Symmetry: D2
Subunit: 115 residues, 4 copies
């Protein structure tokens, strides 16, 4: 597992559970091709998206479906989704965690890249 997504809820102080997450890889023609997807677990985490063999250098987009998450909690949100776009680089550490902290009108995101 070289890619992991962690989502937190700043309103309830909890993991953000059952959030849909879609990962795309940028194609040669600049379009976004589907790469991996899933829903966050009870811990707010989504493991098992890809493998080392599949996760080659390139530009990836992680789309977190925040709007559906907030609406399922009965809350009106601002964003359609949260988007995290980055280059995977073999020169740096091998494990990427993309973390996001969600509020209705705001989000924060960070990358934790380790070996």
């Amino acid at each position: 597992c070289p890619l992991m997504v962690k989502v937190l809820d700043a309103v309830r102080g909890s993991p953000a559970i059952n959030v849909a997450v879609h990962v795309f890889r940028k194609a040669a023609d600049d379009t976004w091709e589907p790469f991996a997807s899933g829903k966050t677990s009870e811990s707010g985490e989504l493991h098992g998206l890809t493998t080392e063999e599949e996760f080659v250098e390139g530009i990836y987009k992680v789309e977190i479906d925040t709007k559906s998450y907030w609406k399922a909690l009965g809350i009106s949100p601002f964003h359609e989704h949260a988007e995290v776009v980055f280059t995977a680089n073999d020169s740096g550490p091998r494990r990427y965690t993309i973390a996001a902290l969600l509020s209705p009108y705001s989000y924060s995101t960070t990358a934790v890249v380790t070996n």
Copy 2:
């Protein structure tokens, strides 16, 4: 006035100056049409992107070119850009400020929405 972008640098403790920003609007065919663009000033603010007439209802994407910002400063950052995607003006005209706070491996973004 109807749309304003403010960025800030969390490393320097300063406005993020000269940050390029591209705004897109989702067209009827579901592509992202270029809507407006500009650069942040010495105050980290970008005014004058659009007008009340042209800023109709729709789904908008504000792309803040964070990589270009950090690379112009000689720093190798993580993200390509920060993208802020939202429906606007669906209950009539509002004024939107999209703010972002940048670090090399992280960013925060918020919206301030006001009704004139």
Copy 3:
């Protein structure tokens, strides 16, 4: 002018209005002496806390009364307050903006420091 506090609400997408703020300065005996206080306006800003003369070098604590804010809105938040502690004016006078973005279980804070 030398010290300004801006808060924002990440739930509402608005300025955080009527937020109480207490500033302290570390005294020679290492206690926190009251320095100034005030409330954010309808814009989420708090101006007029101090003067260039009185805002001397020192270690300052800006306490933003987030619990009182959320409880006045009928919400039970996690934190008591947000505390921002920093050395100021140690290389001569600067202008400081302390900003905070509030959620019930979280907050972000940043500083914008400028040299007049």
Copy 4:
């Protein structure tokens, strides 16, 4: 372990390792009494601060020594420390994670409170 502290580095995209963390409990006379302390691990985490028996309701302060952290990396920071002040409440979930994401002139903090 009912209390855990996690610290991340937004400049390097990493755990914040070897950060000193002090926890205080508010006494009856409104002073802060030392409660627990330690240094974050290689994963940016500090476990083992307290036990269920010791961690009674009350107001706690977690002080994260961000200034020393940044200076040890050769970076000039703004804050003296980051401070997280909260009430432990038995009515809510039993496990508290206090997370902080550090930059030189900024920090973010959240609480993840679960059962």
